[PDB]
Paper text:
As such, Sfh5 is the founding member of a new and conserved class of fungal hemoproteins, and provides the first demonstration that the spectrum of ligands for PITP-like proteins extends beyond lipids. In contrast to the known priming lipids of other Sec14-like PITPs, heme is not an exchangeable ligand for Sfh5, and the feeble PtdIns-exchange activity of Sfh5 is strongly enhanced in heme-binding mutants – indicating Sfh5 is not designed to function as a bona fide PITP in vivo.
The crystal asymmetric unit (ASU) contained three molecules of Sfh5 with a single heme-Fe bound to each of the chains. Sfh5 adopted a typical Sec14-fold comprised of eight α-helices, five β-strands, five short 310 helices and a β-hairpin turn. By contrast, the Sfh5 helical gate was shifted by ~18 Å across the cavity opening relative to the position of this substructure in Sec14 -- thereby describing a ‘closed’ Sfh5 conformer. Only ~8 Å2 of the heme surface area was solvent exposed -- as opposed to 835 Å2 for free heme. Bound heme-Fe was in close proximity (2.3 Å) to the hydroxyl group of residue Y175, and tyrosine coordination was consistent with the results of safranin T dye-reduction assays which estimated an unusually low thermodynamic reduction potential for Sfh5 heme (−330 ± 3 mV vs normal hydrogen electrode). The Y175 hydroxyl group also engaged the Nε2-tautomer of the proximal H173 via a hydrogen bond interaction. Only two amino acid side chains (S191 and I225) reside within a 5 Å radius on the distal side of the Fe -- reporting the absence of a sixth coordinating ligand and establishing that bound Fe is penta-coordinate. That vacant coordination site on the distal side of the Fe represents a candidate substrate binding pocket positioned close to the Sfh5 protein surface and to which access from solvent is occluded by the side chains of K188 and K192 of helix A6 on one side and residues L224, I225 of helix A7 and F228 on the loop connecting helix A7 and 310-helix T4, on the other.
Residue numbers in the entry: 1 to 40, 45 to 292
The structure:
């Protein structure tokens, strides 16, 4: 991990040591981040990887430009949200509307390009049929955070080639007339969460099978994300070009190199929470 000048490595050194008190006085002792433990009760012999805890707080300094007092304030807002909301539970415990699970695909390519080995896919174009999934906003957002968290169970935060995620939206089928404020409302809601609570986890996001009559949509949505993640956005009118960016995505649809199996056959279904993730979840269900 690289510091531009000592003073940045000094806010890392300070933050790393402030974490116990921070977590304890203001987060209420919850220290599950992205399925890993970051709070050194000496079971911690067992479930505390230091280099993972350290890369994740690096990740949070980078996100907030090594401005100390901003880092801690958002580290609080993240950890509290992880308690009040339950992101781990959205992925591994809750039941989600069935037509929704079918449009969330999760794939991993052990030999893929850096930070394009873990990908999640939303087949949102399939859901212009069904604009009732969007009236109950909260249950959607719980579905999607569930896919977000399952994606990160596939990352290796210690690595340099697999500590970020890639995401594809397939909008094949959207009609430019059916763009009602229900959809606007789910988008903006999820977006706020990704922005406020999942920073420094996206590498690239591809939006494929999008006609050019949709420019006004793309312009309006983008005003809800920061320049940092906006620079990672790519819009593809022709979905078969996707293999030019994801080397091992399915040949069918996505022009990729895997001609054996399509996207459905590429899915991952064994999802299996992280070690600490499981602890947090089962210990939660004795104090009901
Ligand atoms: C009409 C059907 C659509 C639905 C249901 C939909 C749904 C969503 C949702 C739920 C999100 C936020 C998080 C995501 O799920 O990962 C999102 C984000 C976004 N959408 Fe769409 N969308 C639609 C159409 C479009 C179109 C036509 C465009 C034009 C390019 C577009 C561009 C974007 C962009 C740039 C974001 C921000 C993603 C990010 O910040 O991570 N969407 N959309």
């Amino acid at each position: 991990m690289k510091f531009d000048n000592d003073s940045e490595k000094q806010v890392f050194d300070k933050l790393k040591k402030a974490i116990p008190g921070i977590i304890k006085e203001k987060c209420a002792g919850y220290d599950e981040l992205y399925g890993y433990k970051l709070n050194p009760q000496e079971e911690v012999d067992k479930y505390y990887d230091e280099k993972i805890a350290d890369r994740l707080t690096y990740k949070l300094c980078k996100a907030y430009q090594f401005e100390y007092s901003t880092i801690v304030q958002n580290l609080i807002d993240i950890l509290n949200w992880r308690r009040e909301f339950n992101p781990l539970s959205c992925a591994y415990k809750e039941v989600h509307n069935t037509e929704l699970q079918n449009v969330g695909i999760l794939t991993f390519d052990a030999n893929g390009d850096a930070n394009k080995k873990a990908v999640t896919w939303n087949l949102y174009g399939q859901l212009v049929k069904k604009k009732e999934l969007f009236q109950n906003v909260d249950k959607f957002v719980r579905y999607r955070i569930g896919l977000m968290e399952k994606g990160l169970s596939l990352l290796d935060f210690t690595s340099s080639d697999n500590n970020y995620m890639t995401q594809v939206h397939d909008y094949k089928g959207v009609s430019v007339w059916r763009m009602d404020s229900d959809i606007k409302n789910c988008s903006k809601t999820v977006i706020g969460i990704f922005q406020k609570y999942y920073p420094e986890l996206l590498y690239a996001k591809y939006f494929v099978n999008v006609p050019t009559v949709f420019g006004w949509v793309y312009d309006l949505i983008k005003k809800f994300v920061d320049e940092t993640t906006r620079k990672k956005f790519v819009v593809l009118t022709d979905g078969s070009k996707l293999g030019q960016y994801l080397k091992d995505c399915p040949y069918e649809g996505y022009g990729g190199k895997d001609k054996k199996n399509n996207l459905t056959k590429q899915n991952v279904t064994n999802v299996h929470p992280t070690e600490y993730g499981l602890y947090i979840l089962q210990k939660q269900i004795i104090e009901d």
